Each structure stands twice: as structure tokens, then as C-alpha cells.
Amino acid sequence: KPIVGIANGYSTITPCNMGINDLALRAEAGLRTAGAMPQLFGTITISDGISMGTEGMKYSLVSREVIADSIETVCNGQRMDGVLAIGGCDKNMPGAMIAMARLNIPSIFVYGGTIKPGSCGGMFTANTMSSAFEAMGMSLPYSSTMAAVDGEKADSTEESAKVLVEAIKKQILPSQILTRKAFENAIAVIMAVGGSTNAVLHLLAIANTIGVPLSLDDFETIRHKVPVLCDLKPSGKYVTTNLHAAGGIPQVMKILLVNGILHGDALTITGQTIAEVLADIPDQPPAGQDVIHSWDDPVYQEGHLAVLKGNLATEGSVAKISGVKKPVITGPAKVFESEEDCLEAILAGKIQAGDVVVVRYEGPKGGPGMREMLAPTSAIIGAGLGDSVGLITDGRFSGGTYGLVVGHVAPEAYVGGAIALVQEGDQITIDAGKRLLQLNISEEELAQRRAQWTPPQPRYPRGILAKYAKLVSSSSLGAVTDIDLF
């Protein structure tokens, strides 16, 4: 008599999560007929209620940690034999996967599904992560690109429940599926579909949670070996429903397998390996569609998620180099200690062509919460400066500019990264061709500035933001909150 949890994602009623509840009954149905006793339970979410530009956004990554905590607390508390998480299209559903890695009890992830023709039609965070989850064998094939309102998604939910019951009887564990090879498989797929830069953070967090080595260097290494195969929004032309119709993630994965990238011997939740699961998929995408390009006529010849390093980011940083015409700039620094201070200066006309705008103390501890910042890139585009200024931050930017936009600068300013030592007027070089992010001062003036730097006082001495800032690690570790505590 297995006791199986159903972690029902998106349990914050709003007109946007009607469908997710329809799948929970299907999962509970499939669990009972497969011989399990389901225990349904809900987890929080804040996507579509969060106000972009204010501090609500600082709670977004925080809610990823709260979701992981809830599932781990319930599943351990209820001594469950397995758990099925239904993640809706919310930016913090990677929290369920972090919990599965922590629990290491048999698990399967059911994506709530995509919407048909905004943020859940293109390859933003949720769709990138759900596809990544399928690429790692934690979701059934085709399941990550099904539409939410479609019947095959309900059928896939029941089937996931059945497979999970088999996985409990066979003890197929997350630690056996979420291997280094599965993560390498997920990075390749994320490059091949033009996925979100947020997936870098979430994949690092899952790997550092389960105990397999993964670093930003591995993203950059795989980036050069894997072309962008899919022409997908936001950067590209099609939406997830077109990708699904053209063969979905299995077709993408099979192209990567036959062309030497994918690890075919990695295991999936059904007990079959990747190569076995893809055995009947054609080696090339169908004719008559250009959603999925062929290996020899890709959308781009290498991946789009570049890692820049240098004295300004000794641990690394992430820049999407997709629609960037000139991927180099050297300019004078304009520095801000918050998103607000930066937006204020842009609107006041204080940023000119040629500037390198630095938004610091927005990192995991500095924010706290490493919030996504949309206002700075949008305001830069409105000022007509998109193609003539660079943007760097220890936080995250959403939206592009047609210029160089760099996030995840690590070490962050709060812990004394060199980004905290930038002074107004310093020259900064952002050079994608050199994969270089550099502060153009002497090594010894940098050390003399470092000797005078003093740690700031926390913005929030108490509350959950304080608890988060106290525990959270660097973004180059995925901003996990449970490592190196003792």
C-alpha cells in the first residue's frame, strides 16, 4: 500500500490556474487504479500577481525555496513513498524539483502545460524548465510541450501516476536519474531550443542540491558544441504549440543524440534509457516545417547562453547573445545600488550612449532574492539607448535591448565581489568574443579598493527576506539555501 503525494502546484486562486486542478484529479485517479493511496496537497505561487518593478519581485526566488521546503516538509512528515508534482507554468515550479532531489524518494514531474496563441507560449522560464525536466528523464516524453487544455495532457498525467507507482516498486530514484549526464543532456536541450537564462540558475540549483558537480563553465563548454535548432519566441518566431506539432522535445533530443551530444545511456523515470525512449524518433525533423531546423541548417551555429568571466566576475556571469549586433562595448561606468536608483537615472536622462550601466546589490544576498529587473532594459529601449549601452548586474534582467545585457555577476556585491568596487567613470569592457567582463583598472588599484571596502548592512534585518539572505549561496551555485551551513 504505497502512500504517494500529489504536490499540486499553483495553489493561489486567480483566474490563471483553473486547469492545474483538473490534472490533480487525474493524478489521484491514476494513483488509485495503480494501487496507491494518493495524498493531495497544495503549494504556494505568486506568478501573475507579482508587480514588476517593485519589491514583490524579490519574493520570486524566495518562493522557489518555500515551495521546495513545503514539499520536503510534507513528504517527510507524512512518510510518503513517492511524490508527483504538478507544476503549472509559474517561474518557481523548479522548487518542486529541488525538493525531489532533497527527498530522493521516487518522483515524477507533470508540467501543467502551455497555453495556445504569452509568457507560457514562448520559451521563458517555465517552458524551458519543463522541457529541461523532460530532457533529464523526470517527465514523460512529449509531456513538456502539450497544451494545458488538451486531453493528451490529462492522459499524460494519469500515465505519469502509473509510471511513478512502477518507479516506487522498482525504486527508481531521483539520484539515479539526475546524474551529471542528465544535466549535460538538459543544458544541450536548453541551448537547442533557445531557452531562458533563468534555466541556468535553476539547473545549477538542482545539481548542487542532489550532489552532482555542475558549474557555469559547463554551460559555456556545451554552448559551443550545440547549435540553436529551434526558432522560438521570445527571441525567435514560433511558440511552443508549433514545436509540439513539429515533434517536440523528443525530436529535438533525437537530433542531439544522433549528432553526438546527448548521453543515450542516461536513465529516465520509466526505467528505459534516453536512447531507448527515443528509438522510434526520426533522425531528422519533419519536412515542411521550420520550427525545428536540421543540424546542418541551424538557427544559430552555437548556443545563445554565454558565460562571461574576468576580474569583474571571477565566478562568472550570464549574457544572452541572441539578437546582439555588436557583441563588444567599452565604456564609462554608471553605478546604482538598486533597480529604483537605476530606473530613476535613466528617466532623468542621466545615461548616455556608450555608457556601461551597473546595477549592484541586487544579488541573492544583496537584494535579497536576486529579483528579475524588467524596468531597466525597458527604460533603456524607450530612451533609444538599447544598442549603445551595456547593462550588467549581480541580479537578473528580463527583456533584451539589442545590446549587451549581463546578469548573475558573481561574486555579488554584497559579499565583496569586484562589482562592489566599481566607481563612477571606471572603464568597463564587455566582450562576448573574448567571453570577457572586465573592470579596466590595475590589479593593484582593485586590491587597494578591496582593502577599503566594508560589508553593507542588510536591507531587511528580519522576516523571510532576512532568513533567505542569511542562508542563500552564490548565483554561480544556483542560489541554493541549504549548503555549507555548518
State the DSSP H helix or E strand holding residue 322, giving kind and residue range, or none if neither.
Answer: none
Q: How many domains does the chain have?
A: 2
Give CA–CA dist 102/91, Å, rounded: 20
Q: What b-and-e string marks burial along 132-143, b requiring 16 or more CB atoms within 10 Å of the CB?
A: bbbbbbbbbbbb
Contact 335, 356 (CB under 8 A): no
**Do 258 and 337 belong to one domain?**
no
- Domain end: 231, 259, 277, which one? 277
Pairing type for strands 37-42 and 3-8 reads parallel
SS3 415: helix
Interior angle at CA 80, CA 76 and CA 84, nearest 5: 105
Residue 298, domain member (yes or no): no
- Domain end: 231, 253, 277, which one? 277
**Do 322 and 216 belong to one domain?**
no
Interior angle at CA 474, CA 473 and CA 475, nearest 5: 120
**Do 271 and 378 belong to one domain?**
no
SS3 464: helix
Pairing type for strands 316-320 and 436-439 reads unpaired
Residues ≥6 apart with Cβ < 8 Å to 445: none
**Do 216 and 333 belong to one domain?**
no
Give CA–CA dist 249/255, Å, rounded: 10
**Do 393 and 272 belong to one domain?**
no
Q: What is the resolution of this structure in A?
A: 2.3
230 belongs to an annotated ligand binding site? no
Query: Residue 281 corresponds to which cell in the numbers above?
Result: 524518433
Q: Which CATH number is 461's domain given? A: 3.50.30.80
DSSP 338: S
Contact 423, 313 (CB under 8 A): no
Give CA–CA dist 345/339, Å, rounded: 10
Residue 294, domain member (yes or no): no
Q: Which CATH number is 163's domain given? A: 3.40.50.2300
DSSP 184: H
309 belongs to an annotated ligand binding site? no
Q: Read out DSSP for 394-450?
A: SSEE-S--SS-EEEEEES-GGGT-GGGG--TT-EEEEETTTTEEEE-S-HHHHHHHH
**Do 377 and 260 belong to one domain?**
no
Query: What are the beta bridge partners of residue 373?
Result: 397
Interior angle at CA 5, CA 269 and CA 135, nearest 5: 25
Pairing type for strands 328-336 and 427-431 reads antiparallel
**Do 32 and 178 belong to one domain?**
yes
Query: Residue 355 corresponds to which cell in the numbers above?
Result: 555608457
State the DSSP H helix or E strand holding residue 439, giving kind and residue range, or none if neither.
Answer: strand 436-439
Query: Residue 48 corresponds to which cell in the numbers above?
Result: 501573475
Which domain, by its residues, includes 85?
A: 3-277
248-258 and 125-135 helices, crossing angle to 10°: 60
Residue 296, domain member (yes or no): no
Residue 109, domain member (yes or no): yes
372 belongs to an annotated ligand binding site? yes
Give CA–CA dist 375/386, Å, rounded: 13
Residue 476 among the catalytic residues = no
Rg from Cα positions in the chain: 22
SS3 191: helix
Give CA–CA dist 21/156, Å, rounded: 15
**Terminal Cα-to-Cα distance of the chain (whole angstroms):** 38
Alpha-carbon dihedral angle through residues 90, 95, 97, 101, given to the nearest 10 degrees: 180
Residue 290, domain member (yes or no): no
Query: Residue 419 corresponds to which cell in the numbers above?
Result: 562589482
Give CA–CA dist 184/277, Å, rounded: 17
Residues ≥6 apart with Cβ < 8 Å to 283: 254, 255, 258
Which one from 107, 196, 398, 473 is the annotated catalytic residue?
Answer: 398
Nearest 5°: phi and psi at 100? -60, -40
State the DSSP H helix or E strand holding residue 141, giving kind and residue range, or none if neither.
Answer: none
State the DSSP H helix or E strand holding residue 62, giving kind and residue range, or none if neither.
Answer: helix 59-77
Nearest 5°: phi and psi at 329? -155, 140
Closest CA to 43 of 4, 85, 15: 85
Q: What b-and-e string marks burial along 171-196, b requiring 16 or more CB atoms within 10 Å of the CB?
A: ebbbebbbbebbbbbbbbbbbbbbbb
CA distances from 429 to 101, 285, 386, 440, 464 (A): 39, 40, 17, 7, 37
**Do 271 and 325 belong to one domain?**
no
SS3 285: coil
Residue 285, domain member (yes or no): no
Contact 295, 323 (CB under 8 A): no
Nearest 5°: phi and psi at 305? -95, 90
Q: How many CB atoms lie within 10 A of CB 353?
A: 11
Give CA–CA dist 87/138, Å, rounded: 12
Q: Is 213 exposed, middle or buried (0-12, 13-18, 19+ CB in 10 A)?
A: exposed
**Do 217 and 328 belong to one domain?**
no
**Do 248 and 355 belong to one domain?**
no
**Do 269 and 327 belong to one domain?**
no
CA 358 to chain centre: 22
Residue 106: CA atoms inside 13 Å, Cβ hemisphere, count? 22
Structure method: X-ray
Give CA–CA dist 391/393, Å, rounded: 7
Residues ≥6 apart with Cβ < 8 Å to 414: 361, 363, 365, 366, 394, 420, 455, 456, 469
Give CA–CA dist 304/319, Å, rounded: 8
Interior angle at CA 454, CA 411 and CA 428, nearest 5: 50
Residue 52, domain member (yes or no): yes
Closest CA to 21 of 40, 46, 2: 40
Residue the block writes with cell 525533423: 285
Residue 293, domain member (yes or no): no
**Do 203 and 77 belong to one domain?**
yes
90 belongs to an annotated ligand binding site? yes
Give CA–CA dist 134/277, Å, rounded: 11
